[PDB]
Amino acid sequence: NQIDLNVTCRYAGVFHVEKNGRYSISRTEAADLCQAFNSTLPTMDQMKLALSKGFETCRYGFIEGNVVIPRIHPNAICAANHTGVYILVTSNTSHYDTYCFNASAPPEEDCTSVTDLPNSFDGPVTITIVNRDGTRYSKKGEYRTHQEDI
Q: Cα(144)–Cα(150) distance, rounded to whole angstroms?
A: 7
Determine whether the annotation assigns residue 136 to a binding site: no
Determine whether the annotation assigns residue 23 to a binding site: no
Residue 28 binds to ligand 4XJ (criterion: CB under 6 A):
no
Q: Cα(57)–Cα(82) distance, rounded to whole angstroms?
A: 12
Reduced to 3 states, what is the DSSP secondary structure of residue 6? strand
Q: Which residue stretch of 22-30, 32-40, 104-112, 120-128 sits at the interface with ligand 4XJ (rule: CB under 6 A)? A: 120-128
> Is 25 in contact with 69 (CB distance < 8 Å)?
no
Site string for ligand 4XJ, 55-74 (x = CB under 6 A): --x-x---------------
Give the helix, strand, coil percentages of the chain, each rounded to 5: 15, 35, 45
| Residues at the interface with ligand 4XJ (CB under 6 A) | 6-8, 16, 18, 21, 57, 59, 122-124, 130-132
Binding residues for hyaluronan: 22, 59-60, 86
